[PDB]
């Protein structure tokens, strides 16, 4: 009856090897999608970055009430949503992080379009969107000589730092470049 | 094991920036903005610990609410003020420099290591500016 | 008996290696085109 | 039986890779602070 | 494989994620995490 | 045998950090912060 016993155990070890086979394949499938995701976001973190073209602001009396920035995609950048981005404003007085808003604000920022389709998303390389920040609202209208340290942080994590330096003299200037 | 070990490597915190409030002439608050890593999952800031190697002390800060020798998390962008769910969420980690040890003077250096629940350590060497004159808020 | 067990697990390991091989290569393919551009 | 041995060695390789991944990231973090300073 | 998104739950939005395990008759499971692109501006068809 | 052998491999300790006190000019305290490894059970630190 030793032929009976081997048959039963043979069935069991087939199942056990199938159980272990599932574990390696299923865990590899888990790590396949996890690793595939990791490469794409990590590349997006390094490549999808905002580049500031030029900075200027409207000035009233002698203290720049509004601060405006012109942004664009960096080299090899996918769609860049300016709505899921946060500019951190480190000014002479206040030092907070601004968030996206619509229709002009207080401690928020607005993005009006200059060239392109969307007015909040940079889709192509020739799109220019104007980041709008109210200086007198976030803190105070910067006098001649104030030095704000702006840093635009994209959703994925790419950070662009711009030191907005107000000219030391604001005389006879309807609107000066920061 | 496969799920936890991948969690140990993947679910990691990246510190976007670090700034500090200034009273009189000393950094009294240490504020840190945090975000997920590439491929991170939901990161809970309540099950995280921060190691504060200060100039005068060395303790491991734990989570609290509304500090002293603990740390609080006020939200910046997103819904949850203690959990980072999406890649566009920013939460501000709050630390009281004049409560975990002594008020950070101009030039003090503190090492902060934010350890997630799964064990992903992120180290940020905070350096108070050498000169603090005429600076209402500094960038650590 | 033990011969049956090692055969099935052998099939498992090559597929897992095939899965792992695809992950690195396809990720390199994404990085190649992104890097090239 | 062969499956039993594979599962145990599978855990070790996952754990060992986690150890190796930890060294790379933590050393990069130390060098990042050194380079930034 | 044709799967109507608007009927199973709802037409996905930019940034969504679905975990799909296509299991055969014999129990072989294949897991795919479909990830809608974070931005759907000016793209007739994407690649999850 | 299966359970203890798995515990030998899976139940492990990970040292998160290693700080220490300083007296005069000598380290009089060695402190270790420890945590479970991936997929570990309860770890009594008295039988270690
Ligand atoms: C930043 O962009 C703002 C976008 O609205 C500009 O706002 C306009 O400024 C004009 C003037 O220069 O003061 C006003 O006539 C418009 O009504 C106002 O919207 C702002 O000038 C610029 O710095
Ligand atoms: C770090 O975060 C703190 C969170 O409470 C900020 O605290 C506020 O600071 C304000 C001011 O800048 O001093 C006070 O008006 C608030 O009452 C206080 O809670 C802190 O400013 C920041 O650096
Ligand atoms: C300008 O020079 C001052 C000379 O006294 C410095 O003052 C000292 O700074 C120390 C520290 O570096 O913050 C404090 O511990 C001393 O109490 C303080 O007098 C000052 O730091 C420097 O910016
Ligand atoms: C650019 O940022 C926009 C910020 O509002 C995104 O807008 C939201 O998109 C959601 C979805 O992803 O389609 C909608 O459910 C929301 O109602 C809409 O405001 C936009 O998707 C993004 O591309
Ligand atoms: C390791 O942990 C020890 C736990 O007791 C710490 O011990 C304290 O150290 C203090 C000082 O830093 O020397 C003493 O004032 C306490 O009495 C002593 O218990 C130790 O500092 C730490 O390195």
The angstrom resolution of this structure is: 3.1
The answer to whether A92 touches A135, Cβ cutoff 8 Å, is no
Tokens of A11: 């069935």
Query: Could you tell me the strand order of the sheet in which A175-176 lies?
Result: A99-100, A108-115, A128-134, A66-73, A50-58, A175-176
Q: Residue A60: which residues within 8 A CB-CB, separation 6 or more?
A: A141
Q: Which of A47, A113, A52 is nearest to A87 (CA)?
A: A52
- What letters, b where the CB count within 10 A reaches 16 and e where it falls short, cover B6-33? bbbbbbbbbbbbbbbbbeeebbebbbbb
Q: Return d(Cα A165, Cα A144) in angstroms, integer.
A: 9
Residue A22 CA: distances (Å) to CA of B93, B108, C15, E26: 42, 55, 11, 12
Beta partners for residue A111, in sequence order: A131
| 3-state SS assignment for residue A50 | strand
Closest atom of ligand 2 to B137 CA is: 23
> What's the gap in Å between the CA of A161 and the closest CA on chain D?
15
Q: Phi/psi zone of residue A61: left (φ > 0), alpha (ψ -120 to 50 degrees), beta?
A: left
Q: Which CA distances in Å does D31 have to A9, B120, B121, D21, D37?
A: 56, 17, 14, 16, 10
Q: What letter would DSSP give residue B118? A: T
DSSP structural state of residue C27? H
Distance B56 CA to ligand 1 centre (A): 51
- Atom 7 in ligand 3: residue holding the nearest Cα: B106
CA B43/CA F29 separation, integer angstroms = 33
Measure in Å the smallest separation between the Cα of D12 and chain F Cα atoms.
7
- Cα separations in angstroms, B33 against B7, B13, B71, B89: 22, 10, 13, 10
Helices (H), B11-130: 97-100
As a three-state string, the secondary structure of D1-37 is: CHHHHHHHHHHHHHHHHHHHHHHHHHHHHHHHHHHHC
Q: Which two tokens stand for residue F6?
A: 């798995």
DSSP for residue F26: B
Express the helix, strand and coil content of chain B in percent, nearest 5 each: 10, 45, 45
Task: Identify whether the C-beta of residue B101 lies closer than 8 Å to the C-beta of residue D6.
Answer: no
Separation of alpha carbons A123 and A126, rounded Å: 9
The DSSP call for residue D37 is: -
**CB distance B51 to B115 below 8 Å:** yes
| Distances from the Cα of E14 to the Cα of A60, B60, B122, E34, angstroms | 41, 40, 30, 12
A135 lines ligand 1 (CB under 6 A): no
How many Cβ pairs closer than 8 A exist between chain A and E?
31
| Alpha-carbon torsion (A158, B90, E14, A36), positive or negative | positive
Which of chain F's residues have a Cβ under 8 Å away from the Cβ of D18? 38
Going by the DSSP 8-state scheme, the letter that residue B105 receives in this structure is: P
- Beta-strand pair A128-134/E29-35: unpaired
Query: Exposed/middle/buried for A166, CB within 10 Å: 0-12, 13-18, 19+?
Result: buried
Is residue A95 within 8 Å of B19, Cβ to Cβ? yes
Judged by 3 or more CB pairs under 8 A, whether F touches B is: yes
Separation CA E28–CA D15 (nearest Å): 26
Secondary structure, 3-state, B121-137: EEEEEEECCCCCCCCCE
Nearest to A151 by CA among A93, A98, A89: A89
* Best residue among B17, B18, B21, B66 to mutate for probing ligand 2, ranked by most atoms within 8 Å of CB: B21
- Pairing state of beta strands B137-138 and B29-36? unpaired
Pocket perturbation via mutation, ligand 5, pick of F21, F26, F28 by most ligand atoms within 8 A of CB:
F21
CA distance D12 to chain A (A): 13
Q: Are B9 and B32 in contact (CB under 8 A)?
A: no
Which ranges constitute the DSSP H helices of E1-48?
5-8
Question: What number does the ligand 1 atom closest to the CA of A68 have?
Answer: 1
Beta-bridge mates of residue A110: A132
Q: For residues E48 and E33, what is the distance between their CA atoms, to the nearest angstrom? A: 8
Contacts of A159 (CB under 8 A, 6+ apart): A49, A151, A152, A153, B16, B17
Phi, psi (5° rounding) for residue E10?
Answer: -165, 155
């Amino acid at each position: 009856q030793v032929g009976i016993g081997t048959l039963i155990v043979f069935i069991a070890m087939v199942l056990v090897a199938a159980i272990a086979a599932g574990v390696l394949i299923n865990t590899a499938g888990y790590l396949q999608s996890k690793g595939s995701a990791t490469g794409e976001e990590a590349s997006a973190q390094v490549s999808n970055r905002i580049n500031i073209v030029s900075a200027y602001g409207n000035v009233x009396x002698x203290x720049v009430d509004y601060v405006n920035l012109t942004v664009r995609q960096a080299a090899g950048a996918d769609n860049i949503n300016l709505x899921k981005s946060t500019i951190q404003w480190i000014g002479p007085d206040x030092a907070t992080t601004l968030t996206y808003x619509x229709x002009x604000x207080x401690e928020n920022f607005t993005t009006x379009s200059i060239k392109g389709x969307x007015x909040x998303v940079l889709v192509d390389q020739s799109d220019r969107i104007k980041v709008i920040m109210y200086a007198x609202x976030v803190x105070x209208x910067l006098x001649x000589g104030x030095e704000v340290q702006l840093t635009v942080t994209t959703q994925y994590g790419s950070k662009t730092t711009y030191w907005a330096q107000v000219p030391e003299s604001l005389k006879d200037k309807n609107a000066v470049x920061l």
